[PDB]
Amino acid sequence: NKAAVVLCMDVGFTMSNSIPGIESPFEQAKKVITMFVQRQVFAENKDEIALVLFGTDGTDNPLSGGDQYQNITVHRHLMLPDFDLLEDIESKIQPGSQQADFLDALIVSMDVIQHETIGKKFEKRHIEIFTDLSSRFSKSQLDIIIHSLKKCDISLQFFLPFSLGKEDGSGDRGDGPFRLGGHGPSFPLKGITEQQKEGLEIVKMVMISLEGEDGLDEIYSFSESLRKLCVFKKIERHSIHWPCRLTIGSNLSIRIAAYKSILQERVKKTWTVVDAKTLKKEDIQKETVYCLNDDDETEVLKEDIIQGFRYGSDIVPFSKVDEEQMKYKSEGKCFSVLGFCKSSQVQRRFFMGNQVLKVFAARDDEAAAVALSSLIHALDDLDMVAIVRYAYDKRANPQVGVAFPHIKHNYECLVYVQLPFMEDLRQYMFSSLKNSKKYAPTEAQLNAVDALIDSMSLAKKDEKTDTLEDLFPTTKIPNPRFQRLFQCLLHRALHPREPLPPIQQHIWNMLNPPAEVTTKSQIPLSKIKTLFPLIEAKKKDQVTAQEIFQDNH
Amino acid sequence: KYSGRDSLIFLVDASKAMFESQSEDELTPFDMSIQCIQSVYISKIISSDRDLLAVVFYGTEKDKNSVNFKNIYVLQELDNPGAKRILELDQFKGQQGQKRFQDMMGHGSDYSLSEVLWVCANLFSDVQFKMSHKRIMLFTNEDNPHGNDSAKASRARTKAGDLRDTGIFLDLMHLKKPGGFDISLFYRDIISIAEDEDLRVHFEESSKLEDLLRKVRAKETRKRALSRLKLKLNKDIVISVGIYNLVQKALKPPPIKLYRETNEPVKTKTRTFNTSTGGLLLPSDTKRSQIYGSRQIILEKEETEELKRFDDPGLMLMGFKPLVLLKKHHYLRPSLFVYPEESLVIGSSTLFSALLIKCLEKEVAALCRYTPRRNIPPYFVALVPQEEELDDQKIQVTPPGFQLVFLPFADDKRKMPFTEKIMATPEQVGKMKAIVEKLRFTYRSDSFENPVLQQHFRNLEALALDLMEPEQAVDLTLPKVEAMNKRLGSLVDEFKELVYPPDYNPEVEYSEEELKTHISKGTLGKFTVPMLKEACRAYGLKSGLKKQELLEALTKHFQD
Amino acid sequence: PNGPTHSSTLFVRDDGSSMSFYVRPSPAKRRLSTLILHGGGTVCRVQEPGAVLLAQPGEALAEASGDFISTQYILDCVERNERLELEAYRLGPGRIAFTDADDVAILTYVKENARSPSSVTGNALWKAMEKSSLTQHSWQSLKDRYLKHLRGQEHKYL
Amino acid sequence: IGELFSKFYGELALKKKIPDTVLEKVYELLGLLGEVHPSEMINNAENLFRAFLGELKTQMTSAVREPKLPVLAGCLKGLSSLLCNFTKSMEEDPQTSREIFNFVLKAIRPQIDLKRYAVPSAGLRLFALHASQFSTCLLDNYVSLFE
DNA sequence: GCGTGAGCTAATCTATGTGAGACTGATGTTAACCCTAACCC
DNA sequence: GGGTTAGGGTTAACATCAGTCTCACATAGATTAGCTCACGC
């Protein structure tokens, strides 16, 4: 449970060669590396990162052969990431004024992995390269790189300054289309030098010969990785095993393993109160002090306190021991099936819980897997869905839920989501929005809003192949809160004087719809504004925090 | 509306035939009525402990009311239900309870049926709060109280009509007794709910009293906005909507600390005490902090809330997505509800209705950036247009509006391990289909109750009325294993033979010298974490939880 | 037609004050209430400052608290029909060495100096280890994770 | 003696939100207690100065929270009616006088019209009561102040 | 220059509910260490 | 007379995570100081 990812940073004159209106590829790589390293530092994940450079004037190659291998400097070896790491990637001021072989960087990273991870346990090693593909090549390698067919858990992941989405994505527009962290529009495809073409070709051939056809989708653009969790792909640890047994009746039991799935995730670290005199937590001290009601008291001790539960207008004195004695007692973890109901009496609105489960199968023994697959296929080809009584442990409360069939071209399993209890449900009374006469919208308003929603559609039926090709999707953007917090913490740790930096531009471009949607909606938005009589500055408060008592100069 | 509290007044008969009944195991109707009132009290104190309940026996020999009237007794006045109020009522249960009532209240003493209704209106009119609803149940085992005197019947009808005009809806829960008569009679023009019924003359069973579903001991009724946000279609055109929640997790009320000697609540006082030098500290000399390895990051209190602010509170629309792109697997939080409100912006309802109509016409869902409070990071939301659905009884079950659906970020999606695809075959998928069809189920939302909450509430009831043993809740979420096994039949064994292989079962002591010798011995082996912890604690060294912490600290300090 | 066959003045104290006992509702309390009522004492509906905190024997939480009187006190006080001392029945009284270094120290000197296939999946041939070849832990765990470590060089080959 | 504590009893400590109006008059009481026989008050602490500050520059320099007017509108008549004793000035300690003057200048400068003229009135009252303590910072930006 | 009374809208202000951050402890899972059907030299 | 080949039976280490606690913020009636203006000085 410890990865070893090596970042193969590129520094070169062509790397810094840029055009107005577009960030330098070196700066884009710096942004991506800063994001990745700061996430893996401020989350305190236990894995070793190696940073190697290629293309700088100096050559500090640990092996370096007997000659050649020039202009590839190994900045740091396999170590736990430190603050100095991202400090000096922000202090790696000068891109090298030279050019080095691209494949030489790959073999340098490979030999670093081999010579630093000989006997240490590493769950999966990794090599990530952020290159330009604009340098002279060497057609003598790939006879040992490919021959090393991953007789180890090292893998490849190439990041290029291109717009690596390799389908019908012509674009080539001139509305300032490129934005770091932008979405949909990207770098103008094609218009590619007579070296980057063969560079991409041999990169594609390497990936095909390494992972297969599925490896084509494993190469990303610099702006793409700022809005995707693709750098940490093949480093993330799987959800932990949860064994149980799905039972129907009394004698029908199938060994099962429910792996965790989509669940809200928070920040692991915590803010500790510290006195502002010596920066020590030990000086601070807090404690609850229970005090009586009449004319205060000296103290009321812990041992003289008992529980109490409100019941009506008075209080009935319960106790901790009585709660433990007389309360609901289940029979440990259980995944019993109450029955089967049509997959139309449960609706997405009547869901609960902060998590979703994917009850996969038993373990590798393919005995219960056949039975579970038969059950899910019988649920899927037919209709109706299985209700389940699920309990985590003896202490955890038992909960009901639904287990929809979920069949994919790669795996087959059910999915669990909690249902509401009787007291858990709330019914409200709302006025009908269709029978009303005051708010019935006229035909002109209907047509205007129809044109509006047709203009701001976030999905194109491209190629007419009955495929709803998706525009900006929100289920792949990483939570911006964590990246913003990491940037703020890093700046405070490096510049303890400056105030909080403003939000990065690429984070803003990450969370905003593609420019085409915004542009195509201007006229419909104007028509809606001039047509709907929705104009009210009804005097109701205003957001003021600091610009009410401050000065000017 | 919001601050109004429902109110209830019972009206228990105490006639001679009301007490005497058939001589069998069936409960006397008086005991049935008292048990039902006790059940209503128990249900209404755990759920919505703010309504007013009062019980007014009529037909008694005694009399207690604001205006002196014969044969009417107000056992309790309008107030919140309480444990003492329940205990004041259970003494009338049983034959001994019947005798206690007879010696304490009496029976017979022919009444008027009008002054009782006047008295009920008196307590209804004596409340200094709002009156959301006013109801009067009339537990009676007779259907024709009068008939020998038409004047009393006319006066009762007039008073009932006056009560209905005032806004008082009475509904009698008729009690059945031996004989053949509980006919629809001089009570039909009195029931101000006027519930729809076949009105069959020859009823031969207890009336709508089992309809109570006695002791539905879990509920917390409330309706509130929970937010009032602005939906920005663009930078300049904004509409105002409210964000209600339709389904929300139910939790038992928090416990209260008590002083053992006096059994009175003790107020708590949390305050950061001195730095071992005396005094108290400011919110201005205690900055927040975090530590990563050897690097300490020191950050002020307000700057901590400053780094998690992105947008002003509101829903920033960002486009429309087809409904077929909202996968069922993705789910984080319970789905919220949006309704157009016209307090901050006038004209929001019309634009909202047009948007809803043309958004569910094209089967698309609005996509927005959601920020509920001042300093919360943005969270994308797909507003699914929920069309109003209504029953034949003109009852709304899915009110119209927009429903939030929290789309998870990529951070909130976990990755599964690789598994091998193994598919079934015919001739056992058919068997599974037969089993499933043999286990039909019409799932409903009002099906199950939280067993933990039910047990806790029953325990509280037992501890507040000394029931001498807690009521054992029938765990509704427990599978009926024997019944479903008998219903299934032998085809389960046909399944088991079909796929499962025949061999597949499916199921202190330490001191200076020993540690000085052991550090050179270098094991610190069978030495358990519980005893390393006690050694480091009783000796006074810094201690943690992981073994390596102690194994390093004790080794480095004890010798060096 | 019997059972309350003890003195009607037992649990009442010598000053005429009835002893107060608190028992949580339970099948035991069903009989204990009648037993105390016939004994002249009183049973508290809820916990009270002046009560006696009864507890059935065997309850871990009550015994750990050490502020409870066994319910057997009541039962043996009925048969004896004589009060007695309360405090007579008062409740209240490393497999570690598998670091990373030995994980490679295993394969070294065995992947070369091992010619008997019976060495694996079978005992012995750790006689060379742990006395001549030190591993500084127990000797029957190399043959428990060579099972977990029947693998290639650190993390595998494929 | 008995009021120095039992009102410092967590008006600066404690985590439970003290109600809005009980963050102005309590500080007013604490400040105005200092003009009654400063003989014993001379050895209490400097904690009152930090308490009157701290929340100032938090009630005044908060970029996340809406300022609460009836907190500093009442904390001002702290430092004012407390400066009547201990004779703080610029010659003997040119450290706290600068921030005191800056804060009162901010208080008397609203930068936006508003109802409930509470803080500015207290600002001018404090400035009028004793401006001699601001010996050298009263004549550096006299034009704007006079305006 | 200045008092003094009326109406109003801004400002609370507590009760109740909901969620985010910190925390704590029972629990079950993986794993170190050794023993055991059975044979067979 | 020692072992071999599997299947596994104790308990220690410890990582998880549901459950509980505290503090901040929302809405909804309920209630009043300030903030003006019309008069008298």
Residue numbers in the entry:
A (entry chain F): 6 to 558
B (entry chain E): 31 to 537, 557 to 609
C (entry chain D): 11 to 103, 132 to 196
D (entry chain A): 149 to 295
Task: Pull text from the paper.
During classical non-homologous end joining (cNHEJ), DNA-dependent protein kinase (DNA-PK) encapsulates free DNA ends, forming a recruitment platform for downstream end-joining factors including ligase 4 (LIG4). DNA-PK can also bind telomeres and regulate their resection, but does not initiate cNHEJ at this position. Here we show that the shelterin components TRF2 and RAP1 form a complex with DNA-PK that directly represses its end-joining function at telomeres.
Consecutive rounds of classification and focused refinement yielded an overall structure at 3.58 Å resolution. Three additional regions of density were observed beyond the core DNA-PK complex: the first sits on the DNA as it enters KU and was modelled as the KU70 SAP domain. The second region engages the neighbouring 10 bp that are protected by RAP1 in our footprinting assays and was modelled as the RAP1 Myb domain. The Myb domain adopts a canonical homeodomain arrangement with the recognition helix inserted into the major groove and a conserved N-terminal arm formed by R133 reaching into the minor groove bound by the KU70 SAP. Our structure suggests that DNA-PK complements this deficit by anchoring the Myb domain close to DNA through a neighbouring loop bound to the side of KU80. The third region sits on the KU70 vWA domain and was modelled as the BRCT domain of RAP1, positioning a conserved basic patch on RAP1 next to an acidic patch on KU. Consistent with our structure, charge reversal mutations in these regions of RAP1 (K39D/R40E/R55E, abbreviated as RAP1(KR/DE)) or KU (KU70 (D496K/E499R) plus KU80 (D327K), abbreviated as KU(DE/KR)) prevented the extended signal in a footprinting assay and crosslinking of RAP1 to KU. Biochemical experiments and cryo-electron microscopy reveal that when bound to TRF2, RAP1 establishes a network of interactions with KU and DNA that prevents DNA-PK from recruiting LIG4.
